[PDB]
Amino acid sequence: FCGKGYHLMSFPQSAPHGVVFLHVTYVPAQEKNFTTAPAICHDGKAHFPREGVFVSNGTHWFVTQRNFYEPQIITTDNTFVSGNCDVVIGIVNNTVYDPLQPELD
Amino acid sequence: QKFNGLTVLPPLLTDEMIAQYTSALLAGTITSGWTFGAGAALQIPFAMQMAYRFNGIGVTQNVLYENQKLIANQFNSAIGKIQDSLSSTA
Amino acid sequence: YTMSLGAENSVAYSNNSIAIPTNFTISVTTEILPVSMTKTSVDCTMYICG
Ligand SMILES: *[C@@H]1O[C@H](CO)[C@@H](O[C@@H]2O[C@H](CO)[C@@H](O)[C@H](O)[C@H]2NC(C)=O)[C@H](O)[C@H]1NC(C)=O
Ligand SMILES: *[C@@H]1O[C@H](CO)[C@@H](O[C@@H]2O[C@H](CO)[C@@H](O)[C@H](O)[C@H]2NC(C)=O)[C@H](O)[C@H]1NC(C)=O
Numbered sequence: 581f582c583g584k585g586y587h588l589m590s591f592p593q594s595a596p597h598g599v600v601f602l603h604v605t606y607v608p609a610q611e612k613n614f615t616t617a618p619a620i621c622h623d624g625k626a627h628f629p630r631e632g633v634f635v636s637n638g639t640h641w642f643v644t645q646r647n648f649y650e651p652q653i654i655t656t657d658n659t660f661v662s663g664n665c666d667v668v669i670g671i672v673n674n675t676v677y678d679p680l681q682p683e684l685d
Numbered sequence: 686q687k688f689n690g691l692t693v694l695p696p697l698l699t700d701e702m703i704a705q706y707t708s709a710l711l712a713g714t715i716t717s718g719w720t721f722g723a724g725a726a727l728q729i730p731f732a733m734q735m736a737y738r739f740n741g742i743g744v745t746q747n748v749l750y751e752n753q754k755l756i757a758n759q760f761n762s763a764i765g766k767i768q769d770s771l772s773s774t775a
Numbered sequence: 776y777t778m779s780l781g782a783e784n785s786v787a788y789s790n791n792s793i794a795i796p797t798n799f800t801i802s803v804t805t806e807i808l809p810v811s812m813t814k815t816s817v818d819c820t821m822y823i824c825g
């Protein structure tokens with residue numbers, strides 16, 4: 581509605597018989613190739629991502645926001661768990677780090 | 686019709702050219718979704734895209750994955766119902 | 776000549792492959808809209824008879 585891309589801000593300017601608007605928008609660029617997986621299997625449970633998608637760099641797995649690559653370790657507190665491992669087509673076998681356990685030592 | 690000083694000018698865009706715009710359009714939104722309408726197209730597997738759109742309404746993503754078969758079936762039988770509504774209803 | 780509609784590039788769709796942006800550019804587009812005309816007026820009798 582207000583310029584191509586994701587609208588961020590606008591400023592009006594005058595004109596003799598009209599109004600000219602400047603619409604400042606965000607546009608993504610420089611995108612890479614990643615492998616994905618709808619959900620992960622860990623100890624028999626399906627771990628779905630909360631905010632973002634699980635993405636693989638070939639030999640490692642992470643979780644990131646869909647707007648901009650910012651990889652992070654797939655941990656218990658960024659992924660919710662529901663149902664069983666064998667239920668949704670497309671899971672992959674991986675591990676999940678639990679931040680609590682390093683504290684018990 | 687047109688026989689004494691009246692005419693009709695042809696359109697600039699022919700039927701095959703419009704059907705080429707609409708083929709490009711709905712061949713994009715399958716492969717890239719809203720993305721291709723902002724910048725470069727980004728290939729995203731379809732089922733993931735639908736799951737996201739579910740999150741976009743307010744239903745937890747897992748609902749789509751668990752029920753993927755029923756969803757696909759309802760979609761298909763709906764397209765066929767439209768095909769027949771149009772094929773018969775004047 | 777016959778007009779071209781644009782470039783022809785097909786997307787490498789897969790069922791386990793996603794493309795993700797790693798940078799961004801903010802761009803300031805412009806838009807123009809009229810909102811008025813000259814408030815004209817004509818005296819009908821002077822125009823016709825004067
Ligand atoms: C994702 O990976 C593919 C292949 O690994 C990249 O490939 C090319 O894209 C062009 C576009 O038309 C195709 O014709 C080629 O067949 C693709 N494969 C090649 C050249 O090996 C693609 O560019 C990557 N996309 C992103 C966003 O990283
Ligand atoms: C995928 O990502 C992982 C994690 O970044 C990469 O593993 C790292 O490789 C670098 C380069 O040797 C090492 O310095 C790091 O120690 C590694 N990470 C750790 C701490 O395990 C991996 O090389 C990447 N591979 C691909 C194909 O993208």
Ligand SMILES: *[C@@H]1O[C@H](CO)[C@@H](O[C@@H]2O[C@H](CO)[C@@H](O)[C@H](O)[C@H]2NC(C)=O)[C@H](O)[C@H]1NC(C)=O
Binds near residue numbers: 670790791
């Ligand atoms: C995604 O597509 C690929 C290729 O179409 C599918 O791979 C086929 O899967 C069957 C069942 O496991 C295998 O017998 C075939 O050999 C696979 N083909 C290839 C070329 O690898 C895959 O199953 C699809 N679904 C995913 C990955 O979830």
Ligand SMILES: *[C@@H]1O[C@H](CO)[C@@H](O[C@@H]2O[C@H](CO)[C@@H](O)[C@H](O)[C@H]2NC(C)=O)[C@H](O)[C@H]1NC(C)=O
Binds near residue numbers: 671672673
């Ligand atoms: C995920 O891990 C499970 C657990 O190892 C795999 O299931 C095993 O499959 C092997 C190969 O046939 C069997 O020998 C084991 O008996 C299975 N374990 C159990 C407890 O069922 C499963 O194949 C893995 N899947 C993927 C995609 O990596």
Ligand SMILES: *[C@@H]1O[C@H](CO)[C@@H](O[C@@H]2O[C@H](CO)[C@@H](O)[C@H](O)[C@H]2NC(C)=O)[C@H](O)[C@H]1NC(C)=O
Binds near residue numbers: 797798799
């Ligand atoms: C995103 O794109 C911009 C566009 O140039 C990149 O900007 C330049 O980065 C180089 C890195 O060596 C700098 O030397 C230049 O000064 C930057 N240009 C400007 C406008 O100052 C930027 O680096 C890209 N993002 C990333 C993460 O590399």
